[PDB]
Amino acid sequence: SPPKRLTREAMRNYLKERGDQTVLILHAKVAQKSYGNEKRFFCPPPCVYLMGSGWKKKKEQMERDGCSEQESQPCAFIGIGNSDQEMQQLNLEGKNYCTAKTLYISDSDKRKHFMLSVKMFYGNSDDIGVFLSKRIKVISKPSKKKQSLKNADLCIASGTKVALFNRLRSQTVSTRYLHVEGGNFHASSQQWGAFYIHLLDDDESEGEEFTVRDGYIHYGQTVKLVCSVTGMALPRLIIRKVDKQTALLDADDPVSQLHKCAFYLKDTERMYLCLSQERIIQFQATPCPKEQNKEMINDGASWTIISTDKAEYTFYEGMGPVLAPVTPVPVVESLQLNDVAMLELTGQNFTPNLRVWFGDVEAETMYRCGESMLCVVPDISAFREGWRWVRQPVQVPVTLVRNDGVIYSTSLTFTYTPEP
């Protein structure tokens, strides 16, 4: 017999105590391919996070039902999706996150883009499912030519996220990533920050608050790097193009994926952002012999820049454990209003077994494809028993529910608006 569908009582219980389980996959947007038998590792290393109070709640539910601590532990593997390459086990013991440090894509694969695939299950072998990263672009190797804006793929837009790493003399063991921990910037061998790179106007003064501009980042512009997790920022920097071990003062082409970069601390005496082992410091450059447009910089002052991305999936077993994996997890990107009032959902991974709920009211739902769903907006009287029209604004959560009771929360709400 089919499993039990979500009851209104169980939806009310969820809305009161929202114990969601979330999987996050953080990763770079591009990756250089490996030829022959070599391994050119993904840098920064993709990182899986188990977020939300739901993991602890789920762990206690399993142990209440007889599971040992080891059987309630989540397990995870990661690999190139849809490939013959082998998956690699992540170590999640004692932590809520793990990095995959030795992934690579062979030129046996002929695809131009791929996704990472994260397979998860509990120690008792109960399946969770398979979660996919965002799309990753394969490059053979970076071009030597100035980057054209016609290929936005390889450029960096103001306000997006980058990672930055330094490597000494071609040695994989020396790789260090810019990262914020305990209020301080440092250069981590194991973790990496994803920093917004904001373009500032040339005349913007140093300050806690600043005005950001739109457009693609070019060498020679002033930028602000802000940790997307901690909110910490560095002082105003001028991002400069590195050639061998010099910074070019006069280059102004667009910044390209995986290019080497130097960050001049604005309004200083030739001071550049520099690591020294784990420490982040500023270090003075030396003017070049007979060349005024270039400055010699410290080994620690050369940073490789790469755009990063984030896949995020959230689920909750609204009627308890189910046989089917909870994946593919639907993701709602937007809601659009559009006879009877209909609400259009746009996103990914929609299926015909989903229903839209407004609050604790299940709505008539029409599946169209994996990216689009239509539902009928409930009359206002389902939320205010006396109302024959909308007297004051009323806001309700929007939630996707599967026929076996899995609940997929969105961050989005619907608001009933009074008639003006």
Partner: peptide, 13 residues
């Protein structure tokens, strides 16, 4: 239009 962030001081050599 506007952003905000606490600025970390970069120590010198």
């Amino acid at each position: 239009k506007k952003a905000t962030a606490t600025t970390w001081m970069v120590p010198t050599a």
